[PDB]
Amino acid sequence: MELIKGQALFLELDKKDFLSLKNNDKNIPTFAHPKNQEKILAIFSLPYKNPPQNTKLIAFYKDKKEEIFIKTLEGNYKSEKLQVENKKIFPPKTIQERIAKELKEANAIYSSYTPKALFNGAFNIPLNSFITSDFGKARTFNEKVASYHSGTDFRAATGTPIYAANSGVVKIAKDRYFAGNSVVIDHGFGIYSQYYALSKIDVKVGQKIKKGELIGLSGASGRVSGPHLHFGILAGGKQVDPLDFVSKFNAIFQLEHHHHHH
Ligand SMILES: [Zn+2]
């Protein structure tokens, strides 16, 4: 199999006598295929940054082992040059404790696995065909610093209402240093959706949220300048192309075949 770096893949395996799916030492959790009761699923994701050239997974069954080979593809990522506030790439030493704190909090959330579906059918995606910066765009900040885009940016006037892409539990709902007013929702199965750069936050941590419920208003408080929604997905432990992820998830989990938007 082949997978573009920075993308997720839904792996389908026989359910009968299955024990474990392992990358190297890492256990990859599995969950029931929602339509085919002879199959189970796992989410496998490749990092955008420094991915392996090839991956070998092993599925352990009671009486056999199966090897799954995945070759990393480079894809067709583009690039942009951006001017940002200097503080966003050179934070003063005195604020780096706050950044380190917010990193530890985020890591605790993403390393906590919810072994049940909190979502409800397909993810909604924004009704918006003006992507100002796609996932994985290579970036040069202020002519000298490099990065890559870890989510997808949609042109939106400040104050555009933002609705949860699916049901789940809110895990983050505050201003964070780099990407501003931020909401993160746990959907179960290690799937998290992210909404950054907001001007207003209308949810609170621990709140159960339904698909299509208002979580805030779009803003211009993010790392990059300009009014936009930053939308992200973390799945399989990695930031992945969120529009691509939603397309693959929805093909499996949608309850109706119609168009999925709020
Ligand atoms: Zn962004």
Author numbering: 20 to 281
Paper excerpt:
This enzyme turns over the cell-wall peptidoglycan by both the d,d-endopeptidase and d,d-carboxypeptidase activities, as documented by mass spectrometric characterization of the requisite reactions with synthetic cell-wall fragments.
We decided to mutate His216 and His247 individually to alanine in order to abrogate the binding of tartrate or citrate at the active site and impair catalysis too. In the case of the H216A variant, tartrate was sometimes observed in the closed form crystal structure; hence, only the H247A variant was pursued further. The structures are: (i) tartrate-bound wild type (WT) (open form), (ii) citrate-bound WT (two structures, closed form), (iii) H216A mutant (open form), (iv) H216A mutant with tartrate (closed form), (v) H247A mutant (open form), (vi) H247A mutant with pentapeptide 1, Ac-l-Ala1-γ-d-Glu2-mDAP3-d-Ala4-d-Ala5 (open form), and (vii) H247A mutant with crosslinked muramyl tetra-tri peptide 2, NAM-l-Ala1-γ-d-Glu2-mDAP3-d-Ala4-mDAP3-γ-d-Glu2-Ala1-NAM (open form). Both molecules bound to the active site of Pgp3 via several hydrogen bonds and salt-bridge interactions between the carboxyl groups of tartrate or citrate and the Zn2+ ion.
